[PDB]
Amino acid sequence: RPTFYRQELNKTIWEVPERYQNLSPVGSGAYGSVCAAFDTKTGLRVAVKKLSRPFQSIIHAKRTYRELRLLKHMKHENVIGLLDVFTPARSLEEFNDVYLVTHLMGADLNNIVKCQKLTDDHVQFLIYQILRGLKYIHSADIIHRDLKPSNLAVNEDCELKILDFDDEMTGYVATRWYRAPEIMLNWMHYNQTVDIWSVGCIMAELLTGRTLFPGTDHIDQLKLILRLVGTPGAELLKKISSESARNYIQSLTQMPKMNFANVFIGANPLAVDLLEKMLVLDSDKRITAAQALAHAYFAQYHDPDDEPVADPYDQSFESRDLLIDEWKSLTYDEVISFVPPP
Numbered sequence: 001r002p003t004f005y006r007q008e009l010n011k012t013i014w015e016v017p018e019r020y021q022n023l024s025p026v027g028s029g030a031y032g033s034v035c036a037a038f039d040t041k042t043g044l045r046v047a048v049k050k051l052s053r054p055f056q057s058i059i060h061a062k063r064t065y066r067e068l069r070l071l072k073h074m075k076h077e078n079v080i081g082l083l084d085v086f087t088p089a090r091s092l093e094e095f096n097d098v099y100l101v102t103h104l105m106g107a108d109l110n111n112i113v114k115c116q117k118l119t120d121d122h123v124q125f126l127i128y129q130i131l132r133g134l135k136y137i138h139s140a141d142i143i144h145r146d147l148k149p150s151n152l153a154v155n156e157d158c159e160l161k162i163l164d165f166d167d168e169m170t171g172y173v174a175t176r177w178y179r180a181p182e183i184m185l186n187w188m189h190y191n192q193t194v195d196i197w198s199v200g201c202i203m204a205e206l207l208t209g210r211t212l213f214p215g216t217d218h219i220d221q222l223k224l225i226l227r228l229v230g231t232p233g234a235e236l237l238k239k240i241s242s243e244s245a246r247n248y249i250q251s252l253t254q255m256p257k258m259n260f261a262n263v264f265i266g267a268n269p270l271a272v273d274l275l276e277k278m279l280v281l282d283s284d285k286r287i288t289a290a291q292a293l294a295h296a297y298f299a300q301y302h303d304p305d306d307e308p309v310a311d312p313y314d315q316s317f318e319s320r321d322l323l324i325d326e327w328k329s330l331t332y333d334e335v336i337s338f339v340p341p342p
């Protein structure tokens with residue numbers, strides 16, 4: 001057991017192993033505050049997230065377990081993984097805090113590309129890495145569900161990692177602009193292809209410097225989407241299990257799909273072709289990450305032998321109802337059994 005020391009970081013008392021030094025706030029994280037630090041044992045700049053009240057409720061305790069389980073599973077260059085997880089607690093009885101450690105990323109995509117049109121080569125590379133990470137994530141039957149520029153971190157080398165797998169979804173907000181229509185409007189049980197829709201939106205924005213579907217609200221956004229991809233056909237309509245949603249869709253005037261070559265004027269014809277394959281209304285028909293990687297647009301980056309898949313991921317716990325202390329004990333076992341990556 002390492003020796004821990006205490007430090008107050010913005011009215012918060014952090015207790016971390018001595019190996020972590022120079023803790024400095026970098027902002028908020030998903031359900032916890034994040035500090036950048038230097039891991040003297042590995043020489044890595046890391047981000048340390050102290051979870052806020054990890055076990056205050058069943059929902060929080062299960063979310064804490066979920067995040068730890070997911071982070072402990074993700075081992076891929078284009079996905080945020082775990083370098084360390086610790087608690088100053090000496091026993092399950094005293095267990096109350098959880099700290100998660102990851103590589104420190106330089107900036108999120110949003111802050112880098114905001115209002116800026118990128119060069120085709122840069123788009124090729126950024127999207128290639130997103131799809132490579134997605135192939136890995138999807139191979140484990142994991143769906144990201146909230147892919148957007150702010151959840152994509154990049155370093156100075158444009159090296160990219162996917163991270164962070166309602167009032168905040170209302171209005172003119174980027175929190176909803178990259179969502180596939182079927183999840184935005186709860187049309188049906190959605191699959192991993194919702195993530196491909198998000199990549200298409202991100203890719204279009206990198207190419208034009210403009211949000212693809214910057215709706216002022218959910219409906220305005222759907223209209224922007226249908227004007228581009230066309231209103232659904234009978235085949236897709238049958239798949240919208242939500243009768244309410246299906247019924248509203250049917251009230252819209254039919255529109256044929258636009259010519260993407262005339263929307264993305266001047267864009268590489270191959271980028272155009274890939275966008276048309278990702279931004280397909282029917283999720284059953286969207287190109288998969290594995291198929292997209294093999295698309296000619298990524299000819300200069302694709303390598304079938306360097307696009308790994310993940311080990312199987314058991315998420316049977318998602319359908320389990322346990323007590324706070326049971327989720328807490330399962331989380332403790334996962335913290336205690338953690339083995340750092342080489």
Ligand SMILES: O=C1Nc2nc(N[C@H]3CC[C@H](O)CC3)ncc2CN1c1ccccc1Cl
Pocket residue numbers: 026027028029030034047048049071080100101102103104105106107108153163164
């Ligand atoms: O929340 C997180 N934020 C990060 N930020 C940066 N860099 C930021 C980018 C935005 C900039 O404004 C400040 C530095 N790098 C890595 C993470 C990792 N990270 C995380 C995810 C899951 C579990 C634990 C953690 Cl710490």
